[PDB]
Design a protein around this ligand. Structure first.
Ligand code: 45D
Length: 145
């Protein structure tokens, strides 16, 4: 990330894990119109295998699996994610978001609201250029774990 994007990324990593997940969901909704949907052109993608392992879990454990991706760990799902390239890692998150929209991954609860104190960060992200937001995501997903 560049000089203008580093502060936003650093703030993001300082939120609690649940807040990070929610912000990633809201970020997806904001970016979605300008994103090409997953999967990529390759069929045997390693990202699909990691997503598929998460999809096969109960919804509650899908949530725990996504929490563990941000927190880090050495379990099977973390290891599958950690072996991926940064763009493949981002593919997993994109597949998860698409799964939330098609009903195969646990969705954002209708009663959830962000903890107080996210307004400044979301305002700052809204001011970033599209290229800066792409670099934010590539750097953020690689830094998880
Ligand atoms: C006939 C003939 C010829 C003709 C040659 C011709 C016709 C040449 C034409 C060549 C063309 C059309 C090349 C296109 C390349 C596209 C690239 C690299 C796209 C990258 C996209 C990216 C990174 C996307 C990224 C992204 C993704 C995916 C998103 O999902 C959203 C974000 C973002 C947009 C950033 C010659 C000239 C050779 C000789 C003369 C002659 O007779």
């Amino acid at each position: 990330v560049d000089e203008s994007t580093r502060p936003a990324l650093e703030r993001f990593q300082r939120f609690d894990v649940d807040t990070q997940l929610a912000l990633l969901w809201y970020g997806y909704l904001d970016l979605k119109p300008q994103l090409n949907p997953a999967p990529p052109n390759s069929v045997d993608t390693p990202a699909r295998a990691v997503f598929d392992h998460i999809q096969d879990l109960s919804q509650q454990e899908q949530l725990q699996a996504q929490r563990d991706l941000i927190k880090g760990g050495s379990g099977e799902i973390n290891r599958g994610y950690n072996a991926l390239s940064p763009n493949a890692k981002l593919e997993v998150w994109l597949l998860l978001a698409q799964g939330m929209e098609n009903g195969t991954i646990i969705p954002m609860p209708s009663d959830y609201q962000l903890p107080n104190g996210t307004e400044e960060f979301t305002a700052q992200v809204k001011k970033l250029e599209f290229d800066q937001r792409l670099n934010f995501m590539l750097t953020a997903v690689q830094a998880m774990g």
